[PDB]
Amino acid sequence: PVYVDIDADSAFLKALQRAYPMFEVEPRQVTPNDHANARAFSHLAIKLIEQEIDPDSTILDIGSAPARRMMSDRKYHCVCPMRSAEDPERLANYARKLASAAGKVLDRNISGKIGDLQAVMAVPDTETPTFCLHTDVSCRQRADVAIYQDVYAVHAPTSLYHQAIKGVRLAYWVGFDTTPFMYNAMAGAYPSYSTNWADEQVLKAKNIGLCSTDLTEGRRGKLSIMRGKKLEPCDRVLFSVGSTLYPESRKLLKSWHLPSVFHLKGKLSFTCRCDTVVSCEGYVVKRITMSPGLYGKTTGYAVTHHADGFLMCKTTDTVDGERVSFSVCTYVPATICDQMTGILATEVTPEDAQKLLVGLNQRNTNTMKNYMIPVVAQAFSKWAKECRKDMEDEKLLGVRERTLTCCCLWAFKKQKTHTVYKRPDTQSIQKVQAEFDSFSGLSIPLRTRIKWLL
């Protein structure tokens, strides 16, 4: 069995048992994490990856803590770029966890890993079998499995190519579903994992998941130096997994939304596939295989299967007091989606839809988080309405009705789409890019401390 640190009466345990049928998932709650689900998923994700891959294979852990990786029989070789403030504490914790294992293991190469840390604290740029201080672009070790566990700040094709040229033929990416960022939403939620993310421009909104505003009477309106008149989603996004905050860029998030087939054509050439192997309510495990030489052709399309509904709607909020409208995305449980089918046959108001959603939810054992019921309600009310206007404005079969621009071009009226509702068992198809061909860090007071611990 596999023990997950979630409450025994948790409703996420069934979702987590479906996503992992090959395991016996048992709750062993030992810590009141506010993002316990996001970790109960990744623990099982590594448990599954370690079964799929060959035991005699060497694994590379990009941006991962070496502390969690030991006590495992797999030949891990963690690569620690030390790009953030957690890596020095991660290395301190690794050195400290090795000390309590000097003799009480004699099964997990502890006596080799102590030597491996002291030998890399002797020479920093060195390449040891199970530890190094390089970036994933800088490491010189040769393996055949790579694992990107919660690694979003990396450009996908560049890093994948740099792993492939080192002999990596299999790669696993455990992370959040990058689909809300291909639809290019402003703010969004992963409610089953207590995760909220927002574009920095709307961090002062009133009521979205990740926001914080102030009280006011609305009588100033004079402090605009330069007009915006344009509130598109910029590049910087902030994620809050429970209470843990991470900054990301939309570019490096969208880069991991890889197509089914792509080509990495640098000094060497590889043809690569990307398969979503696990998917639970917004948290995915993707499998990339890379093989030498160009084979086949690439369509440049990426598919997302929706097991649970996916909404993206236009919501009206007040960012920093100013009433704007932007796009918010969320995941709705497939049960709620299936039970709204009959009501969305007509035009329902957001009040009626919210009362019906609260009924379906409470029927204290909630199916979906309630902070998303208002917006979802509004989303449904818009969708059901835009479905009636499609029915009243029936066109002719196979014809269009373009209008001349009066010089040489044609014009067609665009309709206003306020909601994109991807029901369960539908798919999203996004045109992405394939055919990619365009591919220190530690102090002395720390280097003295990491080997003093051993």
Active site residues: 35
Under the criterion CB under 8 A, does residue 438 sit at the interface with a second copy?
no
Record the tokens describing residue 84, joined without a space.
């953030």
Among residues 53 and 137, whose Cβ is nearest to a second copy? 53
139 binds, among a second copy, Zn ion, none (CB under 5 to 8 A by kind): Zn ion
* 400 CB-near residues (< 8 Å, 6+ apart): 412
Q: In this structure, are residues 36 and 5 in contact, taking their beta carbons and an 8 Å threshold?
A: yes
Distance (Å, rounded) from C-alpha 40 to C-alpha 7? 11
141 binds, among Zn ion, a second copy, none (CB under 5 to 8 A by kind): Zn ion
Under the criterion CB under 8 A, does residue 271 sit at the interface with a second copy?
yes
Among residues 103 and 397, whose Cβ is nearest to a second copy? 397
Stated as kind and residue range, the H or E segment containing 277 is strand 269-280
Q: In this structure, are residues 301 and 260 in contact, taking their beta carbons and an 8 Å threshold?
A: yes
Q: How many CB atoms lie within 10 A of CB 56?
A: 8
Under the criterion CB under 8 A, does residue 308 sit at the interface with a second copy?
no
Residue span 71-90 as binding mask against a second copy, x where in contact by CB under 8 A, dash where not: -----------xxxxxxxx-
User: Among the candidate windows 110-118, 122-130, 133-141, 267-275, which touches a second copy by CB under 8 A?
Assistant: 267-275
Distance (Å, rounded) from C-alpha 379 to C-alpha 271? 40
Under the criterion CB under 8 A, does residue 14 sit at the interface with a second copy?
no
In 3D, which of 22, 18, 16, 21 has the Cα closest to residue 39?
16
Distance (Å, rounded) from C-alpha 350 to C-alpha 364? 24
Strand 283-292 and strand 170-176: the pairing is: antiparallel
Q: Report the residue closest to Zn ion, judged by CB.
A: 132
Q: How far is the CB of 87 from a second copy (least distance, A)?
A: 7
Under the criterion CB under 8 A, does residue 267 sit at the interface with a second copy?
no
Under the criterion CB under 8 A, does residue 198 sit at the interface with a second copy?
yes
Among residues 70 and 186, whose Cβ is nearest to a second copy? 186
Question: What sign has the CA pseudo-torsion 256, 57, 106, 72?
Answer: positive
Q: Which 47-66 positions form the footprint of a second copy (CB under 8 A)?
A: 54
Q: In this structure, are residues 371 and 206 in contact, taking their beta carbons and an 8 Å threshold?
A: no
Under the criterion CB under 8 A, does residue 2 sit at the interface with a second copy?
no
Q: In this structure, are residues 191 and 369 in contact, taking their beta carbons and an 8 Å threshold?
A: yes
Among residues 137 and 334, whose Cβ is nearest to a second copy? 334
Q: Which residue in 24, 104, 107, 243 binds a second copy (CB under 8 A)?
A: 243
Q: Which residues pair with 131 in a beta bridge?
A: 78
Within a 13 Å sphere around the CA of 190, how many CA atoms are in the beta-carbon half? 24
User: Among the candidate windows 59-67, 70-78, 125-133, 429-437, which touches a second copy by CB under 8 A?
Assistant: 429-437
278 binds, among a second copy, Zn ion, none (CB under 5 to 8 A by kind): a second copy
Q: Which 313-352 positions form the footprint of a second copy (CB under 8 A)?
A: 313-314, 316-318, 321-327, 335, 337-339, 341-342, 344-346, 350-351
Residue span 176-195 as binding mask against a second copy, x where in contact by CB under 8 A, dash where not: ------xxx------x--x-
Among residues 80 and 288, whose Cβ is nearest to Zn ion? 80
Number of residues near a second copy (by CB under 8 A): 171
Under the criterion CB under 8 A, does residue 217 sit at the interface with a second copy?
yes
Is 162 among the annotated ligand-binding positions? no
Distance (Å, rounded) from C-alpha 82 to C-alpha 89? 10
Among residues 18 and 140, whose Cβ is nearest to a second copy? 18
Distance (Å, rounded) from C-alpha 55 to C-alpha 168? 15
In 3D, which of 312, 428, 445 has the Cα closest to residue 372?
312
Among residues 112 and 351, whose Cβ is nearest to a second copy? 351
Is 127 among the annotated ligand-binding positions? yes
Distance (Å, rounded) from C-alpha 189 to C-alpha 177? 11
Q: Give DSSP secondary structure letters for 86-131.
A: HHHHHHHHHHHHHHTTTTT-SSS-HHHHHHHHHHHHH-TT---SSE
Is 77 among the annotated ligand-binding positions? yes
Q: How far is the CB of 139 from a second copy (least distance, A)?
A: 19
Q: Which 365-394 positions form the footprint of a second copy (CB under 8 A)?
A: 366, 369-371, 373-374, 377-378, 386-387, 390-391, 393-394
132 binds, among Zn ion, a second copy, none (CB under 5 to 8 A by kind): Zn ion
Packing angle, helices 110-122 and 444-452, rounded to 10: 160
- Where on the chain is the footprint of Zn ion (CB under 5 A)? 127, 132, 139, 141
Q: Which residues pair with 188 in a beta bridge?
A: 197, 329
DSSP state letter for 345: G
Q: How far is the CB of 438 from a second copy (least distance, A)?
A: 20
Under the criterion CB under 8 A, does residue 140 sit at the interface with a second copy?
no
Q: Please state the residue numbers annotated as binding site for Zn(2+).
A: 77, 127, 132, 139
Specify binding-site residues.
77, 127, 132, 139
